[PDB]
PDB file of all heavy atoms in Angstrom:
ATOM      1  N   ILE D   1       3.784   7.154 -19.969  1.00 40.34           N
ATOM      2  CA  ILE D   1       3.541   6.814 -18.571  1.00 40.34           C
ATOM      3  C   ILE D   1       2.091   6.392 -18.428  1.00 40.34           C
ATOM      4  O   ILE D   1       1.199   7.154 -18.823  1.00 40.34           O
ATOM      5  CB  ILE D   1       3.831   8.002 -17.620  1.00 40.34           C
ATOM      6  CG1 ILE D   1       5.307   8.401 -17.700  1.00 40.34           C
ATOM      7  CG2 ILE D   1       3.457   7.623 -16.192  1.00 40.34           C
ATOM      8  CD1 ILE D   1       5.660   9.716 -17.019  1.00 40.34           C
ATOM      9  N   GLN D   2       1.868   5.197 -17.866  1.00 43.27           N
ATOM     10  CA  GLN D   2       0.559   4.625 -17.700  1.00 43.27           C
ATOM     11  C   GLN D   2       0.255   4.420 -16.213  1.00 43.27           C
ATOM     12  O   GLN D   2       1.105   3.919 -15.444  1.00 43.27           O
ATOM     13  CB  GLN D   2       0.489   3.307 -18.455  1.00 43.27           C
ATOM     14  CG  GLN D   2       0.428   3.488 -19.972  1.00 43.27           C
ATOM     15  CD  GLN D   2       0.835   2.237 -20.744  1.00 43.27           C
ATOM     16  OE1 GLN D   2       1.901   1.667 -20.524  1.00 43.27           O
ATOM     17  NE2 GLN D   2      -0.014   1.814 -21.668  1.00 43.27           N
ATOM     18  N   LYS D   3      -0.941   4.829 -15.813  1.00 43.50           N
ATOM     19  CA  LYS D   3      -1.491   4.513 -14.520  1.00 43.50           C
ATOM     20  C   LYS D   3      -2.030   3.097 -14.550  1.00 43.50           C
ATOM     21  O   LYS D   3      -2.702   2.688 -15.504  1.00 43.50           O
ATOM     22  CB  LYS D   3      -2.539   5.559 -14.129  1.00 43.50           C
ATOM     23  CG  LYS D   3      -3.365   5.279 -12.887  1.00 43.50           C
ATOM     24  CD  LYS D   3      -2.558   5.311 -11.586  1.00 43.50           C
ATOM     25  CE  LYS D   3      -2.235   6.727 -11.128  1.00 43.50           C
ATOM     26  NZ  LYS D   3      -3.412   7.398 -10.513  1.00 43.50           N
ATOM     27  N   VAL D   4      -1.684   2.322 -13.523  1.00 40.19           N
ATOM     28  CA  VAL D   4      -2.076   0.923 -13.412  1.00 40.19           C
ATOM     29  C   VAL D   4      -3.275   0.772 -12.443  1.00 40.19           C
ATOM     30  O   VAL D   4      -3.170   1.105 -11.280  1.00 40.19           O
ATOM     31  CB  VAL D   4      -0.876   0.071 -12.898  1.00 40.19           C
ATOM     32  CG1 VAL D   4      -1.256  -1.399 -12.741  1.00 40.19           C
ATOM     33  CG2 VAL D   4       0.347   0.211 -13.803  1.00 40.19           C
ATOM     34  N   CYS D   5      -4.401   0.235 -12.918  1.00 39.27           N
ATOM     35  CA  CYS D   5      -5.622   0.177 -12.137  1.00 39.27           C
ATOM     36  C   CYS D   5      -6.060  -1.263 -12.070  1.00 39.27           C
ATOM     37  O   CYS D   5      -6.262  -1.927 -13.093  1.00 39.27           O
ATOM     38  CB  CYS D   5      -6.728   1.064 -12.728  1.00 39.27           C
ATOM     39  SG  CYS D   5      -6.285   2.817 -12.910  1.00 39.27           S
ATOM     40  N   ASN D   6      -6.156  -1.745 -10.844  1.00 37.74           N
ATOM     41  CA  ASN D   6      -6.619  -3.084 -10.544  1.00 37.74           C
ATOM     42  C   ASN D   6      -7.184  -3.085  -9.121  1.00 37.74           C
ATOM     43  O   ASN D   6      -6.426  -2.959  -8.131  1.00 37.74           O
ATOM     44  CB  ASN D   6      -5.462  -4.076 -10.658  1.00 37.74           C
ATOM     45  CG  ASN D   6      -5.911  -5.511 -10.505  1.00 37.74           C
ATOM     46  OD1 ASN D   6      -6.549  -5.875  -9.521  1.00 37.74           O
ATOM     47  ND2 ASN D   6      -5.570  -6.338 -11.482  1.00 37.74           N
ATOM     48  N   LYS D   7      -8.495  -3.248  -9.035  1.00 37.84           N
ATOM     49  CA  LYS D   7      -9.248  -3.172  -7.770  1.00 37.84           C
ATOM     50  C   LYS D   7      -8.764  -4.214  -6.765  1.00 37.84           C
ATOM     51  O   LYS D   7      -8.474  -3.902  -5.608  1.00 37.84           O
ATOM     52  CB  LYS D   7     -10.734  -3.367  -8.091  1.00 37.84           C
ATOM     53  CG  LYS D   7     -11.714  -3.312  -6.928  1.00 37.84           C
ATOM     54  CD  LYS D   7     -13.104  -3.773  -7.390  1.00 37.84           C
ATOM     55  CE  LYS D   7     -13.849  -4.587  -6.337  1.00 37.84           C
ATOM     56  NZ  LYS D   7     -14.195  -3.752  -5.157  1.00 37.84           N
ATOM     57  N   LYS D   8      -8.622  -5.443  -7.226  1.00 39.42           N
ATOM     58  CA  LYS D   8      -8.236  -6.548  -6.371  1.00 39.42           C
ATOM     59  C   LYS D   8      -6.864  -6.302  -5.766  1.00 39.42           C
ATOM     60  O   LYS D   8      -6.667  -6.409  -4.548  1.00 39.42           O
ATOM     61  CB  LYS D   8      -8.188  -7.824  -7.195  1.00 39.42           C
ATOM     62  CG  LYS D   8      -8.316  -9.115  -6.406  1.00 39.42           C
ATOM     63  CD  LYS D   8      -9.643  -9.812  -6.712  1.00 39.42           C
ATOM     64  CE  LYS D   8      -9.769 -11.145  -5.989  1.00 39.42           C
ATOM     65  NZ  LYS D   8     -11.145 -11.700  -6.146  1.00 39.42           N
ATOM     66  N   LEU D   9      -5.896  -5.970  -6.616  1.00 38.29           N
ATOM     67  CA  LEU D   9      -4.571  -5.723  -6.126  1.00 38.29           C
ATOM     68  C   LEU D   9      -4.529  -4.504  -5.213  1.00 38.29           C
ATOM     69  O   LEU D   9      -3.790  -4.531  -4.249  1.00 38.29           O
ATOM     70  CB  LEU D   9      -3.550  -5.564  -7.267  1.00 38.29           C
ATOM     71  CG  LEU D   9      -3.310  -6.827  -8.079  1.00 38.29           C
ATOM     72  CD1 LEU D   9      -2.424  -6.511  -9.280  1.00 38.29           C
ATOM     73  CD2 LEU D   9      -2.699  -7.942  -7.224  1.00 38.29           C
ATOM     74  N   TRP D  10      -5.310  -3.463  -5.514  1.00 37.58           N
ATOM     75  CA  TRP D  10      -5.342  -2.251  -4.688  1.00 37.58           C
ATOM     76  C   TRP D  10      -5.926  -2.593  -3.299  1.00 37.58           C
ATOM     77  O   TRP D  10      -5.384  -2.188  -2.265  1.00 37.58           O
ATOM     78  CB  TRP D  10      -6.145  -1.121  -5.366  1.00 37.58           C
ATOM     79  CG  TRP D  10      -6.232   0.108  -4.496  1.00 37.58           C
ATOM     80  CD1 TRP D  10      -7.336   0.576  -3.827  1.00 37.58           C
ATOM     81  CD2 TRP D  10      -5.149   0.981  -4.136  1.00 37.58           C
ATOM     82  NE1 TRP D  10      -7.000   1.682  -3.081  1.00 37.58           N
ATOM     83  CE2 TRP D  10      -5.672   1.961  -3.258  1.00 37.58           C
ATOM     84  CE3 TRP D  10      -3.798   1.035  -4.478  1.00 37.58           C
ATOM     85  CZ2 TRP D  10      -4.883   2.985  -2.714  1.00 37.58           C
ATOM     86  CZ3 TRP D  10      -3.011   2.052  -3.938  1.00 37.58           C
ATOM     87  CH2 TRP D  10      -3.564   3.018  -3.069  1.00 37.58           C
ATOM     88  N   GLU D  11      -6.992  -3.388  -3.278  1.00 34.91           N
ATOM     89  CA  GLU D  11      -7.642  -3.717  -2.015  1.00 34.91           C
ATOM     90  C   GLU D  11      -6.750  -4.552  -1.169  1.00 34.91           C
ATOM     91  O   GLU D  11      -6.639  -4.315   0.025  1.00 34.91           O
ATOM     92  CB  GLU D  11      -8.988  -4.377  -2.259  1.00 34.91           C
ATOM     93  CG  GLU D  11      -9.924  -3.342  -2.878  1.00 34.91           C
ATOM     94  CD  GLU D  11     -11.378  -3.757  -2.973  1.00 34.91           C
ATOM     95  OE1 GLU D  11     -11.693  -4.960  -2.824  1.00 34.91           O
ATOM     96  OE2 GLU D  11     -12.200  -2.844  -3.213  1.00 34.91           O
ATOM     97  N   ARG D  12      -6.040  -5.477  -1.808  1.00 39.33           N
ATOM     98  CA  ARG D  12      -5.023  -6.239  -1.138  1.00 39.33           C
ATOM     99  C   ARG D  12      -3.943  -5.347  -0.492  1.00 39.33           C
ATOM    100  O   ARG D  12      -3.491  -5.591   0.654  1.00 39.33           O
ATOM    101  CB  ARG D  12      -4.406  -7.190  -2.146  1.00 39.33           C
ATOM    102  CG  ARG D  12      -3.309  -8.089  -1.633  1.00 39.33           C
ATOM    103  CD  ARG D  12      -2.945  -9.115  -2.714  1.00 39.33           C
ATOM    104  NE  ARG D  12      -4.135  -9.780  -3.269  1.00 39.33           N
ATOM    105  CZ  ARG D  12      -4.152 -10.520  -4.385  1.00 39.33           C
ATOM    106  NH1 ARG D  12      -3.044 -10.730  -5.092  1.00 39.33           N
ATOM    107  NH2 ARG D  12      -5.295 -11.060  -4.795  1.00 39.33           N
ATOM    108  N   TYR D  13      -3.517  -4.323  -1.230  1.00 35.45           N
ATOM    109  CA  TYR D  13      -2.445  -3.457  -0.756  1.00 35.45           C
ATOM    110  C   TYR D  13      -2.913  -2.666   0.472  1.00 35.45           C
ATOM    111  O   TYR D  13      -2.190  -2.585   1.464  1.00 35.45           O
ATOM    112  CB  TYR D  13      -1.967  -2.491  -1.872  1.00 35.45           C
ATOM    113  CG  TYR D  13      -1.043  -1.412  -1.352  1.00 35.45           C
ATOM    114  CD1 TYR D  13       0.224  -1.727  -0.946  1.00 35.45           C
ATOM    115  CD2 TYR D  13      -1.477  -0.107  -1.190  1.00 35.45           C
ATOM    116  CE1 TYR D  13       1.085  -0.765  -0.458  1.00 35.45           C
ATOM    117  CE2 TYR D  13      -0.632   0.874  -0.689  1.00 35.45           C
ATOM    118  CZ  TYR D  13       0.652   0.526  -0.326  1.00 35.45           C
ATOM    119  OH  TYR D  13       1.538   1.416   0.172  1.00 35.45           O
ATOM    120  N   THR D  14      -4.114  -2.119   0.396  1.00 34.52           N
ATOM    121  CA  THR D  14      -4.643  -1.233   1.452  1.00 34.52           C
ATOM    122  C   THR D  14      -5.042  -1.991   2.723  1.00 34.52           C
ATOM    123  O   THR D  14      -4.899  -1.470   3.829  1.00 34.52           O
ATOM    124  CB  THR D  14      -5.828  -0.365   0.961  1.00 34.52           C
ATOM    125  OG1 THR D  14      -6.869  -1.194   0.461  1.00 34.52           O
ATOM    126  CG2 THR D  14      -5.401   0.555  -0.161  1.00 34.52           C
ATOM    127  N   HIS D  15      -5.503  -3.223   2.584  1.00 35.15           N
ATOM    128  CA  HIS D  15      -5.783  -4.040   3.759  1.00 35.15           C
ATOM    129  C   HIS D  15      -4.488  -4.286   4.523  1.00 35.15           C
ATOM    130  O   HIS D  15      -4.431  -4.211   5.731  1.00 35.15           O
ATOM    131  CB  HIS D  15      -6.425  -5.362   3.340  1.00 35.15           C
ATOM    132  CG  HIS D  15      -6.687  -6.286   4.487  1.00 35.15           C
ATOM    133  ND1 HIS D  15      -5.817  -7.294   4.847  1.00 35.15           N
ATOM    134  CD2 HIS D  15      -7.697  -6.323   5.389  1.00 35.15           C
ATOM    135  CE1 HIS D  15      -6.288  -7.924   5.909  1.00 35.15           C
ATOM    136  NE2 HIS D  15      -7.427  -7.354   6.255  1.00 35.15           N
ATOM    137  N   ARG D  16      -3.422  -4.548   3.796  1.00 37.20           N
ATOM    138  CA  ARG D  16      -2.176  -4.832   4.426  1.00 37.20           C
ATOM    139  C   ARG D  16      -1.578  -3.546   5.042  1.00 37.20           C
ATOM    140  O   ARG D  16      -0.987  -3.587   6.118  1.00 37.20           O
ATOM    141  CB  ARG D  16      -1.235  -5.496   3.417  1.00 37.20           C
ATOM    142  CG  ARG D  16       0.170  -5.730   3.906  1.00 37.20           C
ATOM    143  CD  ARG D  16       0.159  -6.647   5.102  1.00 37.20           C
ATOM    144  NE  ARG D  16       1.492  -6.782   5.658  1.00 37.20           N
ATOM    145  CZ  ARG D  16       1.746  -7.166   6.907  1.00 37.20           C
ATOM    146  NH1 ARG D  16       0.759  -7.452   7.741  1.00 37.20           N
ATOM    147  NH2 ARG D  16       2.989  -7.264   7.319  1.00 37.20           N
ATOM    148  N   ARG D  17      -1.741  -2.424   4.351  1.00 36.73           N
ATOM    149  CA  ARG D  17      -1.214  -1.143   4.804  1.00 36.73           C
ATOM    150  C   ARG D  17      -1.852  -0.742   6.168  1.00 36.73           C
ATOM    151  O   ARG D  17      -1.158  -0.342   7.100  1.00 36.73           O
ATOM    152  CB  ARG D  17      -1.480  -0.070   3.743  1.00 36.73           C
ATOM    153  CG  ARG D  17      -1.026   1.318   4.147  1.00 36.73           C
ATOM    154  CD  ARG D  17      -1.267   2.320   3.031  1.00 36.73           C
ATOM    155  NE  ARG D  17      -2.682   2.535   2.795  1.00 36.73           N
ATOM    156  CZ  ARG D  17      -3.183   3.294   1.828  1.00 36.73           C
ATOM    157  NH1 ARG D  17      -2.393   3.910   0.969  1.00 36.73           N
ATOM    158  NH2 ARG D  17      -4.484   3.445   1.718  1.00 36.73           N
ATOM    159  N   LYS D  18      -3.155  -0.906   6.281  1.00 35.74           N
ATOM    160  CA  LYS D  18      -3.834  -0.713   7.582  1.00 35.74           C
ATOM    161  C   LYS D  18      -3.244  -1.581   8.732  1.00 35.74           C
ATOM    162  O   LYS D  18      -2.930  -1.056   9.808  1.00 35.74           O
ATOM    163  CB  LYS D  18      -5.317  -0.950   7.418  1.00 35.74           C
ATOM    164  CG  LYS D  18      -6.127  -0.555   8.630  1.00 35.74           C
ATOM    165  CD  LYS D  18      -7.579  -0.926   8.445  1.00 35.74           C
ATOM    166  CE  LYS D  18      -8.352  -0.666   9.732  1.00 35.74           C
ATOM    167  NZ  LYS D  18      -9.798  -0.431   9.483  1.00 35.74           N
ATOM    168  N   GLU D  19      -3.044  -2.881   8.499  1.00 36.39           N
ATOM    169  CA  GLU D  19      -2.430  -3.761   9.508  1.00 36.39           C
ATOM    170  C   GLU D  19      -1.066  -3.291   9.961  1.00 36.39           C
ATOM    171  O   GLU D  19      -0.739  -3.346  11.150  1.00 36.39           O
ATOM    172  CB  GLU D  19      -2.238  -5.189   8.971  1.00 36.39           C
ATOM    173  CG  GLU D  19      -3.502  -5.995   8.711  1.00 36.39           C
ATOM    174  CD  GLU D  19      -3.202  -7.398   8.148  1.00 36.39           C
ATOM    175  OE1 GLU D  19      -2.073  -7.649   7.653  1.00 36.39           O
ATOM    176  OE2 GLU D  19      -4.104  -8.267   8.204  1.00 36.39           O
ATOM    177  N   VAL D  20      -0.233  -2.885   9.003  1.00 35.64           N
ATOM    178  CA  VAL D  20       1.091  -2.409   9.311  1.00 35.64           C
ATOM    179  C   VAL D  20       1.008  -1.122  10.114  1.00 35.64           C
ATOM    180  O   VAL D  20       1.761  -0.939  11.044  1.00 35.64           O
ATOM    181  CB  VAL D  20       1.934  -2.155   8.027  1.00 35.64           C
ATOM    182  CG1 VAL D  20       3.226  -1.468   8.371  1.00 35.64           C
ATOM    183  CG2 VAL D  20       2.236  -3.469   7.293  1.00 35.64           C
ATOM    184  N   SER D  21       0.114  -0.236   9.715  1.00 34.53           N
ATOM    185  CA  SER D  21      -0.076   1.060  10.354  1.00 34.53           C
ATOM    186  C   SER D  21      -0.475   0.915  11.828  1.00 34.53           C
ATOM    187  O   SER D  21       0.073   1.567  12.730  1.00 34.53           O
ATOM    188  CB  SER D  21      -1.176   1.787   9.595  1.00 34.53           C
ATOM    189  OG  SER D  21      -1.389   3.059  10.143  1.00 34.53           O
ATOM    190  N   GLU D  22      -1.420   0.025  12.064  1.00 31.79           N
ATOM    191  CA  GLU D  22      -1.819  -0.319  13.430  1.00 31.79           C
ATOM    192  C   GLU D  22      -0.698  -0.922  14.285  1.00 31.79           C
ATOM    193  O   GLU D  22      -0.702  -0.747  15.491  1.00 31.79           O
ATOM    194  CB  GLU D  22      -3.030  -1.223  13.393  1.00 31.79           C
ATOM    195  CG  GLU D  22      -4.273  -0.459  12.974  1.00 31.79           C
ATOM    196  CD  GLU D  22      -5.456  -1.353  12.629  1.00 31.79           C
ATOM    197  OE1 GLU D  22      -5.458  -2.559  12.981  1.00 31.79           O
ATOM    198  OE2 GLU D  22      -6.400  -0.831  11.990  1.00 31.79           O
ATOM    199  N   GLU D  23       0.285  -1.574  13.674  1.00 33.86           N
ATOM    200  CA  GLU D  23       1.461  -2.065  14.416  1.00 33.86           C
ATOM    201  C   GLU D  23       2.635  -1.071  14.488  1.00 33.86           C
ATOM    202  O   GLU D  23       3.724  -1.453  14.942  1.00 33.86           O
ATOM    203  CB  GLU D  23       1.988  -3.378  13.801  1.00 33.86           C
ATOM    204  CG  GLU D  23       1.013  -4.556  13.799  1.00 33.86           C
ATOM    205  CD  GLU D  23       1.466  -5.725  12.913  1.00 33.86           C
ATOM    206  OE1 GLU D  23       2.678  -5.922  12.699  1.00 33.86           O
ATOM    207  OE2 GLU D  23       0.596  -6.463  12.412  1.00 33.86           O
ATOM    208  N   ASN D  24       2.461   0.165  14.005  1.00 37.12           N
ATOM    209  CA  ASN D  24       3.557   1.141  13.994  1.00 37.12           C
ATOM    210  C   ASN D  24       3.017   2.559  14.224  1.00 37.12           C
ATOM    211  O   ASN D  24       3.114   3.429  13.357  1.00 37.12           O
ATOM    212  CB  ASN D  24       4.337   1.042  12.688  1.00 37.12           C
ATOM    213  CG  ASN D  24       5.601   1.879  12.681  1.00 37.12           C
ATOM    214  OD1 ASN D  24       6.445   1.758  13.567  1.00 37.12           O
ATOM    215  ND2 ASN D  24       5.770   2.709  11.647  1.00 37.12           N
ATOM    216  N   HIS D  25       2.438   2.754  15.410  1.00 38.84           N
ATOM    217  CA  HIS D  25       1.867   4.027  15.875  1.00 38.84           C
ATOM    218  C   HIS D  25       1.114   4.805  14.792  1.00 38.84           C
ATOM    219  O   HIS D  25       1.376   5.999  14.549  1.00 38.84           O
ATOM    220  CB  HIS D  25       2.931   4.886  16.607  1.00 38.84           C
ATOM    221  CG  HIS D  25       4.244   5.012  15.895  1.00 38.84           C
ATOM    222  ND1 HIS D  25       5.372   4.323  16.284  1.00 38.84           N
ATOM    223  CD2 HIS D  25       4.621   5.775  14.846  1.00 38.84           C
ATOM    224  CE1 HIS D  25       6.382   4.637  15.494  1.00 38.84           C
ATOM    225  NE2 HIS D  25       5.951   5.516  14.610  1.00 38.84           N
ATOM    226  N   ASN D  26       0.171   4.102  14.157  1.00 41.78           N
ATOM    227  CA  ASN D  26      -0.623   4.612  13.031  1.00 41.78           C
ATOM    228  C   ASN D  26       0.166   5.270  11.897  1.00 41.78           C
ATOM    229  O   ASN D  26      -0.245   6.316  11.393  1.00 41.78           O
ATOM    230  CB  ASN D  26      -1.665   5.572  13.554  1.00 41.78           C
ATOM    231  CG  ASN D  26      -2.574   4.908  14.533  1.00 41.78           C
ATOM    232  OD1 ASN D  26      -3.243   3.936  14.191  1.00 41.78           O
ATOM    233  ND2 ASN D  26      -2.571   5.382  15.782  1.00 41.78           N
ATOM    234  N   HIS D  27       1.297   4.657  11.549  1.00 44.29           N
ATOM    235  CA  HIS D  27       2.209   5.167  10.549  1.00 44.29           C
ATOM    236  C   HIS D  27       2.662   4.024   9.608  1.00 44.29           C
ATOM    237  O   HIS D  27       3.574   3.221   9.928  1.00 44.29           O
ATOM    238  CB  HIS D  27       3.413   5.809  11.217  1.00 44.29           C
ATOM    239  CG  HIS D  27       4.419   6.353  10.264  1.00 44.29           C
ATOM    240  ND1 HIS D  27       4.079   7.181   9.219  1.00 44.29           N
ATOM    241  CD2 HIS D  27       5.762   6.216  10.213  1.00 44.29           C
ATOM    242  CE1 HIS D  27       5.162   7.499   8.540  1.00 44.29           C
ATOM    243  NE2 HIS D  27       6.205   6.943   9.132  1.00 44.29           N
ATOM    244  N   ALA D  28       2.012   3.974   8.455  1.00 47.78           N
ATOM    245  CA  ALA D  28       2.343   3.037   7.354  1.00 47.78           C
ATOM    246  C   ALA D  28       3.718   3.274   6.803  1.00 47.78           C
ATOM    247  O   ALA D  28       4.387   2.320   6.377  1.00 47.78           O
ATOM    248  CB  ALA D  28       1.308   3.151   6.245  1.00 47.78           C
ATOM    249  N   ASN D  29       4.179   4.528   6.847  1.00 46.37           N
ATOM    250  CA  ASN D  29       5.513   4.848   6.335  1.00 46.37           C
ATOM    251  C   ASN D  29       5.545   4.441   4.846  1.00 46.37           C
ATOM    252  O   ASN D  29       6.407   3.683   4.392  1.00 46.37           O
ATOM    253  CB  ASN D  29       6.607   4.168   7.185  1.00 46.37           C
ATOM    254  CG  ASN D  29       7.992   4.757   6.973  1.00 46.37           C
ATOM    255  OD1 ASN D  29       8.165   5.889   6.519  1.00 46.37           O
ATOM    256  ND2 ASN D  29       9.007   3.982   7.323  1.00 46.37           N
ATOM    257  N   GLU D  30       4.571   4.970   4.116  1.00 48.75           N
ATOM    258  CA  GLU D  30       4.379   4.724   2.681  1.00 48.75           C
ATOM    259  C   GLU D  30       5.303   5.586   1.789  1.00 48.75           C
ATOM    260  O   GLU D  30       5.378   6.806   1.942  1.00 48.75           O
ATOM    261  CB  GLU D  30       2.927   5.016   2.323  1.00 48.75           C
ATOM    262  CG  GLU D  30       2.551   4.487   0.945  1.00 48.75           C
ATOM    263  CD  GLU D  30       1.128   4.767   0.557  1.00 48.75           C
ATOM    264  OE1 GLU D  30       0.803   5.955   0.294  1.00 48.75           O
ATOM    265  OE2 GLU D  30       0.322   3.792   0.524  1.00 48.75           O
ATOM    266  N   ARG D  31       6.023   4.951   0.885  1.00 46.35           N
ATOM    267  CA  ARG D  31       6.865   5.643  -0.080  1.00 46.35           C
ATOM    268  C   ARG D  31       6.466   5.319  -1.525  1.00 46.35           C
ATOM    269  O   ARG D  31       5.743   4.341  -1.764  1.00 46.35           O
ATOM    270  CB  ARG D  31       8.314   5.237   0.107  1.00 46.35           C
ATOM    271  CG  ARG D  31       8.807   5.296   1.538  1.00 46.35           C
ATOM    272  CD  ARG D  31       8.825   6.702   2.085  1.00 46.35           C
ATOM    273  NE  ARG D  31       9.177   6.654   3.503  1.00 46.35           N
ATOM    274  CZ  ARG D  31      10.412   6.614   3.970  1.00 46.35           C
ATOM    275  NH1 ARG D  31      11.436   6.628   3.155  1.00 46.35           N
ATOM    276  NH2 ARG D  31      10.614   6.546   5.279  1.00 46.35           N
ATOM    277  N   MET D  32       6.951   6.158  -2.450  1.00 50.24           N
ATOM    278  CA  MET D  32       6.904   5.914  -3.875  1.00 50.24           C
ATOM    279  C   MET D  32       8.322   5.595  -4.296  1.00 50.24           C
ATOM    280  O   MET D  32       9.231   6.406  -4.119  1.00 50.24           O
ATOM    281  CB  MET D  32       6.389   7.131  -4.642  1.00 50.24           C
ATOM    282  CG  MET D  32       4.930   7.478  -4.371  1.00 50.24           C
ATOM    283  SD  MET D  32       3.713   6.231  -4.864  1.00 50.24           S
ATOM    284  CE  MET D  32       4.043   6.064  -6.607  1.00 50.24           C
ATOM    285  N   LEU D  33       8.511   4.398  -4.850  1.00 49.80           N
ATOM    286  CA  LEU D  33       9.803   3.884  -5.144  1.00 49.80           C
ATOM    287  C   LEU D  33       9.857   3.169  -6.485  1.00 49.80           C
ATOM    288  O   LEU D  33       8.854   2.693  -6.970  1.00 49.80           O
ATOM    289  CB  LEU D  33      10.169   2.898  -4.030  1.00 49.80           C
ATOM    290  CG  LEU D  33      10.313   3.472  -2.622  1.00 49.80           C
ATOM    291  CD1 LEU D  33      10.473   2.336  -1.600  1.00 49.80           C
ATOM    292  CD2 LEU D  33      11.519   4.403  -2.587  1.00 49.80           C
ATOM    293  N   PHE D  34      11.052   3.055  -7.059  1.00 49.66           N
ATOM    294  CA  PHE D  34      11.197   2.430  -8.358  1.00 49.66           C
ATOM    295  C   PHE D  34      11.415   0.926  -8.222  1.00 49.66           C
ATOM    296  O   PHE D  34      12.028   0.451  -7.237  1.00 49.66           O
ATOM    297  CB  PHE D  34      12.341   3.073  -9.121  1.00 49.66           C
ATOM    298  CG  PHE D  34      12.061   4.491  -9.497  1.00 49.66           C
ATOM    299  CD1 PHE D  34      12.575   5.533  -8.741  1.00 49.66           C
ATOM    300  CD2 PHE D  34      11.191   4.785 -10.551  1.00 49.66           C
ATOM    301  CE1 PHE D  34      12.287   6.849  -9.037  1.00 49.66           C
ATOM    302  CE2 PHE D  34      10.916   6.121 -10.882  1.00 49.66           C
ATOM    303  CZ  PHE D  34      11.442   7.144 -10.109  1.00 49.66           C
ATOM    304  N   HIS D  35      10.924   0.174  -9.206  1.00 51.57           N
ATOM    305  CA  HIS D  35      11.227  -1.255  -9.315  1.00 51.57           C
ATOM    306  C   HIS D  35      11.471  -1.599 -10.782  1.00 51.57           C
ATOM    307  O   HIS D  35      10.604  -1.323 -11.639  1.00 51.57           O
ATOM    308  CB  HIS D  35      10.089  -2.102  -8.752  1.00 51.57           C
ATOM    309  CG  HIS D  35      10.364  -3.583  -8.750  1.00 51.57           C
ATOM    310  ND1 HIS D  35      11.134  -4.189  -7.780  1.00 51.57           N
ATOM    311  CD2 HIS D  35       9.929  -4.588  -9.566  1.00 51.57           C
ATOM    312  CE1 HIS D  35      11.184  -5.498  -8.003  1.00 51.57           C
ATOM    313  NE2 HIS D  35      10.454  -5.765  -9.072  1.00 51.57           N
ATOM    314  N   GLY D  36      12.645  -2.152 -11.072  1.00 53.04           N
ATOM    315  CA  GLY D  36      12.980  -2.670 -12.416  1.00 53.04           C
ATOM    316  C   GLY D  36      13.104  -4.177 -12.412  1.00 53.04           C
ATOM    317  O   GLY D  36      13.765  -4.744 -11.532  1.00 53.04           O
TER     318      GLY D  36
END
C-alpha cells in the first residue's frame, strides 16, 4: 500500500472541496471510496 503525494493535485482537490462546501451548508460530504 502506497500513499500518493502530489502538491498540485492536492491543491486542486482542496480548492474545489471548499467551493462545494460553501454551496452545501459548509458540508463537503467527503468520502473514502474505491476506484478500479
Side-chain angles (χ1 to χ4, degrees):
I1 298 169
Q2 287 160 307
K3 171 67 76 76
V4 179
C5 303
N6 186 306
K7 181 190 143 67
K8 202 112 177 172
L9 294 173
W10 178 252
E11 293 190 345
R12 180 172 311 167
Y13 169 71
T14 57
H15 177 264
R16 174 61 185 158
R17 177 178 67 184
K18 190 185 174 155
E19 292 179 343
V20 171
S21 181
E22 288 168 16
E23 299 167 28
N24 188 54
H25 47 256
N26 301 300
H27 179 50
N29 197 21
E30 193 180 71
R31 311 295 174 85
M32 293 297 302
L33 296 172
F34 293 99
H35 184 80

